[PDB]
Every structure is written in C-alpha cells, then in structure tokens.
Structure 1
Amino acid sequence: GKVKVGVNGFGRIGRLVTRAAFNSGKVDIVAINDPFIDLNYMVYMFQYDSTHGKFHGTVKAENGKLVINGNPITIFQERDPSKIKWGDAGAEYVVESTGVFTTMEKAGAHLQGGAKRVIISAPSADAPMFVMGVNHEKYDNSLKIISNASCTTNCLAPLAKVIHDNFGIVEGLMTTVHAITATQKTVDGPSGKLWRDGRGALQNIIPASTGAAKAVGKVIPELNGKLTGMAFRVPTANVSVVDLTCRLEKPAKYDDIKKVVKQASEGPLKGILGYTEHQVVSSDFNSDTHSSTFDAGAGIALNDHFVKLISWYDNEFGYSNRVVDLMAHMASKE
C-alpha cells in the first residue's frame, strides 16, 4: 500500500528524510544514490548523529545492500541522474535532495530512469511549490515535478496564513535567527560569491539574506509582494526562530491573536502548527516534528495594528517530516 520512495543524495536532508520515513512508517525507502559514499560509510553515517543521537533500530550492510530494520535497500553510485535505474529498484517517487538539480529540466532527468514523480527538497525557480497545511490541496496529480520550498518557508507559511485569514496582513518584514548549516566554514575560509558566508561560523554572526518570505507569496497568492526579510546565522546547532513584524487591517489585541492561533493549532493545523505558553528556549524544540511553534510569551504588540510574532522550528526534523507527509498525501491522491 505504501508508495516506494528512492532518495538521491545522502547528505543531511537525505539522511534525515530516511530517518523520518523509517520512524513514521508512512512510506518505504527502497533505493539510495550517492556517488561519493560507500556502503560501510553509509552505515556509519546513518547510525550515528551528533544532533539527534543514535538511531533507534538496527542498521547493517549485507550483500551490498543497506539493511535498516530488516528492510534491504538498493545502493547506487551513479553521478549522472539520467543513468540511475530507479525503475529496476521499484522506486516510484524520487526525492531530489542534492541541491544542484532544482530546475524542472535538470530534475526531470530522474524520469528517464523510470521514476513516476520527483519531489525537490529545496526552492525551485519554476517547479510548483507546496506547503503542507497551507496549499497542499492544490495538488491535482497531473504534475510530475514539484517542490517543498524550504524550512523557513514551511515555518512562516502556516502562521502567516492564519494571521491573514483572521486579521488581514497588510505588509510584514521577517527576521530569522538561523543555526549553522553545512555551507558555512568551520574557520574563516574562502567564499566565491557570498563573502560574509566564508567567515568563521563559530565566532561570527554573519548576517545573511533569504527568499523564504518572498516564496510565501508564491504559496499564498493573496500575500504576493507584501513580505520580505533577511536572516542571521548564529553559532548554535539545530534550532532556529522566526520573527515576523506585520501591520494588520482589523484591530487585534494580543489575546485575540493567541486565541485564534491556539484554535488553529488544535483542530485544522494539528501536528503542523504548535502552540505553547511555557518559558521555552531553543533546545526545547530539538527533534520536534512541528513545522512551527507559536511562542505566546515572547511576542509583543506596540498597538492594535502593529505586532511582532515569534515562532520556533527545527530546521532539520520538521522539514523532513513535511517531505514525508507530502509524499504520503501524493500517494493517497493517486
């Protein structure tokens, strides 16, 4: 019943997606492709994680196949995506997580190998974007290549949708305090395009830009041209926070905002948007599957039309779980 999924690239996103798929069980992984990691290294990388701890289960290599919880997984080492025999392994959906094939033309090479549909775990210039709980009902099954946007967009979209539906956002600017990523340098190093990104990650705030706020307009058409922002990269490990400053049409006291956010988090957006009133910190959301958790006590309102909202999100676990959920919904809609 569950759809067969193949993963391209065994980086951070690919490993986390495999972990989420095996933890939730909504889909079955049957093939992985990576031209620079061998089988034993794959076992070592999957077994041990610095951020999320040891894998809860059994992983081993046998007969040239990665066996996780007794499920053999075919391993490929092709560099050209058009040469990967996805159909032979039985994979129906393919997750493109390498981060280098983001356009529709580049990502469509996987279709030649026998895959039916391709999901891009990154923003795409021309592929359609879907965010779970916001516009995933727009999927009609006639699209072969889509996109899951990014972690920041997935965190910002549900809260922005609720706020716009209840009070009518007029314009907003977003600032996100982000954790370090794999593109940063351990010590001040060489950067070709972004000079700031080449500086030492352990001792530099390194202010950075981001197009997630713009992409929210793509996900929600009514908010097109009304959002934008930047980002800061602090020397933390896993958890990021989003800060949204927006102007509302209708008057909205902070208690009303809290009530509507809690109501949305309970019924319609259960498991996607969280709500908390405790004195939480960043480490309290490690390995949390929510796309975004609204922090009631951290926000502040200048008046009835000018507020600042704070939302937490795990940029590793939440995005992978959202990718798995999107694949499951796509399989159900088939």
Structure 2
Amino acid sequence: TVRVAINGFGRIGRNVVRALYESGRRAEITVVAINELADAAGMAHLLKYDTSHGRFAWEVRQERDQLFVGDDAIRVLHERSLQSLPWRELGVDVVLDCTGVYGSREHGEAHIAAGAKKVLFSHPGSNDLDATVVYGVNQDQLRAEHRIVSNASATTNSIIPVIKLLDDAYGIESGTVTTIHSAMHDQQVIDLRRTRAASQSIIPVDTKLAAGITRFFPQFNDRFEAIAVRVPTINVTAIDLSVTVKKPVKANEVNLLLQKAAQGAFHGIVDYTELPLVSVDFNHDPHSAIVDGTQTRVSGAHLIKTLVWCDNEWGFANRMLDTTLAMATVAFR
C-alpha cells in the first residue's frame, strides 16, 4: 500500500479518512499516522460522529497514542512544528496536509526534510508549489519530481472540469461565476459581515475562485470573475457558471456534451443528471461536480449558463485520495 500520514484532523482530514474506508481505497492506501494538536479521544469522537456525514460505520476506538478504525491501528501524533514530525520512522510516502495553515514551498520542504517523500496540500497554497492537480483534467501532467503538490480547492475541482469541457468544445471568450456555499463550511477563501447576528441571511463572501481559475488557465486572465454567497443550507454547494463562447450552441447540445463527459472521459469526476433533485440529494456524493442539466441555458446562441452541484467536502476528500495515488504511481514509474 501507499503509506500516508495526515497532518491536520479537522473536517478535511477526518473526511479523507472516512472516504479511504468507504470507497475501498484502503486496498491501495494505508493511513499510518495522524497529527493534530488536540486530545486523541476528541479526535476519535469527531471521526465517529458528524452532522453532515452521519455516524461513521467502522468501529472507532482510541487508546494511548493509537486511533483504531476497525482492526487498523493509526499512530496519533501531537507535534507543533513540522521539523519534529517523525516521518522517516513511519515510512511516509505522501503526507496529506489538511491543516489549511501550512501551504508554502517552505512548508512542503519541511515535511520532506522530516522524511515524507511527497506532500499533498488540501488547498491552493502559495504559487511556487510544484504542481496543482485537478483530478480528471491534469493528473497525467504529474512528474516524479513534483514532490510538493496542491490539490486546488473543492470549488475549483468542481468547475474547472466543466470550464475545460466547454472551452474545448466551444472556445470560451469570457466567464463569470457565482458560488452558493452552505453556511456551515469553515473557510473557502479570505470582515464586518462575519461578526453579524443570527438572522439566517444570505451573506456575501470573498471568493478565491477566479484566481484559481486563472492560475489553472492563464489564457483566462482579464476574462474571468467570481462572487460568492453563504446561505444557511445543509452541505451542498451550487456553482452558477456563465460563459461566452465563439462557436454557436443550443442548450440541448451543451447538455449532450456534458452528459457524454459524465458517462465517458470524466466518469467518476463529473456526473450529469436530469432528475428533479434538490441540493441534499448530492450530500455524500463523491463526484467533484454534478451538472444539473434541467438548468442549462444558452442566451441566444453564445452565452452559456450551467448550474453544478457538489458536496463541497466529500468530492474533494475523495480527490485527495485519487491525486495521492497518482503521485505514488508516478513515483514508481
């Protein structure tokens, strides 16, 4: 198995661990250690119980410096600084850094200096990492020397594959995006709105989505913008993409294109549906994106609107494991 360590055991790190067992990736990957500055009993407790994701089905036990998931023993560490992480002794092939605080090149090099062979950050990080992977779009650009990698973000994983599809087919000239985030989620991007009363408002929030799009597709500088709101919902996100395109199109053609991708080159990554569903129906769906084809529109012939769903935690948590495996694989090429 690929031996992995997780640095950080908040929502992302705990979901990565849940996704490892639930998805059967446990046949390819073993979590050997988890590092977090908190009580191990508290870690076992939050691993087991979750608002969004239900009770975890595997037996969870904790004793001394071990967390047990089924018969698997995972070492629990509490190290404040990266320099003293015992990654040589654990034989770590990839460290999945889920802290959301570490994310530079220097941080990745600290993990490597501590003995991890490779680092994968659960967010965009600084702009001098080795590679950013959006699984399904560019994982085949990974090289063995890409030792510090970003996995992008949930919302960029969600919409980049759709931007890619429509650009290749139709030629995007410009685009604009709105994300409707669930209110529970901790920090997609970085405020006098945050300190407000409970009013159950729709709350404008700062988005890094356009920066991530234009980092991925620098031919889209000066051509892409994004806004975002938080609403008091139950864990699924909607992304509302509007793009102008060179090639003339009708909605029915756009849906066909997206439906073929879902059933073909993007199977497991982009899904497509025309069922009368609501956001909660995508709760715990491992896809990066589910295109809601009842909502596709073309204004005239050149302004495409498409609405895409994602479980902002579960999709990204499974991508972290897909990317991990693609790194461990290229390492052995």
Q: What TM-score, normalized by structure 1, do the two folds share?
A: 0.93
**Residues 143-179 of structure 1 deviation map (CA, whole Å, 9 limit, x = unaligned):** 2111011011011111110000111111010001001
Question: Residue 314 of structure 2 aligns with which residue?
Answer: 317
- Distance in structure 2 (CA, Å) of the matches to 1:68 and 1:183: 26
Question: Residue 190 of structure 1 aligns with which residue?
Answer: none
* 1:307 CA drift (Å): 2.1
Change in Cα spacing, 1:202 to 1:312, as seen in structure 2 (3 Å) is farther
Q: Is the 8 A contact 2:255 2:296 kept in 1?
A: no
* 1:83 CA drift (Å): 0.9
- Distance in structure 2 (CA, Å) of the matches to 1:23 and 1:112: 32
Aligned partner of 1:142 among 142, 145, 151: 145
Question: Residue 121 of structure 2 aligns with which residue?
Answer: 120
Question: Residue 188 of structure 1 aligns with which residue?
Answer: none
Q: Is the 8 A contact 1:5 1:92 kept in 2?
A: yes
- Distance in structure 2 (CA, Å) of the matches to 1:299 and 1:270: 20
- Distance in structure 1 (CA, Å) of the matches to 2:46 and 2:64: 19
Q: Is the 8 A contact 1:22 1:28 kept in 2?
A: no
Instruction: Map residues 49-128 of structure 1 onto 2, 5 A cutoff.
Output: 49-126=50-127, 127=129, 128=131
- Distance in structure 1 (CA, Å) of the matches to 2:100 and 2:326: 23
* 1:218 CA drift (Å): 2.3
- Distance in structure 2 (CA, Å) of the matches to 1:113 and 1:158: 35
Aligned partner of 1:254 among 251, 257, 265: 251
Instruction: Map residues 233-248 of structure 1 onto 2, 5 A cutoff.
Output: 233-248=230-245
Q: Is the 8 A contact 2:258 2:272 kept in 1?
A: yes
Question: Residue 217 of structure 1 aligns with which residue?
Answer: 214
* 1:87 CA drift (Å): 1.6
**Residues 224-270 of structure 1 deviation map (CA, whole Å, 9 limit, x = unaligned):** 44222010000112100000111110001111101111111111100
Question: Residue 4 of structure 1 aligns with which residue?
Answer: 3
Q: Is the 8 A contact 1:180 1:201 kept in 2?
A: no
The answer on 1:294 being equivalent to 2:277 is no
* 1:201 CA drift (Å): 6.0
Range moving further from structure 2, 80-89 or 7-16: 80-89
- Distance in structure 1 (CA, Å) of the matches to 2:140 and 2:197: 43
Structure 1 letter corresponding to 2:181: H
Range moving further from structure 2, 62-71 or 116-125: 62-71
- Distance in structure 1 (CA, Å) of the matches to 2:16 and 2:222: 32
The answer on 1:130 being equivalent to 2:133 is yes
Gaps of 5+ in 2: none
Structure 2 letter corresponding to 1:110: H
Question: Residue 156 of structure 2 aligns with which residue?
Answer: 153
Aligned partner of 1:207 among 201, 204, 207: 204
* 1:202 CA drift (Å): 5.7
- Distance in structure 1 (CA, Å) of the matches to 2:14 and 2:80: 18
- Distance in structure 2 (CA, Å) of the matches to 1:326 and 1:266: 21
Instruction: Map residues 18-57 of structure 1 onto 2, 5 A cutoff.
Output: 18-24=17-23, 25=26, 26-35=28-37, 37-57=38-58
Identity rate, percent = 37
* 1:214 CA drift (Å): 2.6
Structure 1 letter corresponding to 2:141: K
Change in Cα spacing, 1:140 to 1:295, as seen in structure 2 (3 Å) is same
Range moving further from structure 2, 241-250 or 219-228: 219-228
* 1:299 CA drift (Å): 2.5
Change in Cα spacing, 1:225 to 1:133, as seen in structure 2 (3 Å) is farther
Q: What TM-score, normalized by structure 2, do the two folds share?
A: 0.93
Question: Residue 187 of structure 1 aligns with which residue?
Answer: none
Q: Is the 8 A contact 1:131 1:219 kept in 2?
A: no
- Distance in structure 1 (CA, Å) of the matches to 2:193 and 2:126: 24
Which secondary structure state, in structure 1, belongs to the residue aligned with residue 286 of structure 2? coil
* 1:102 CA drift (Å): 1.3
Note the aligned Cα RMSD (angstroms).
1.5
The answer on 1:229 being equivalent to 2:218 is no
Range moving further from structure 2, 301-310 or 199-208: 199-208
Which secondary structure state, in structure 2, belongs to the residue aligned with residue 196 of structure 1? coil
The answer on 1:163 being equivalent to 2:174 is no
Q: Is the 8 A contact 2:119 2:148 kept in 1?
A: yes
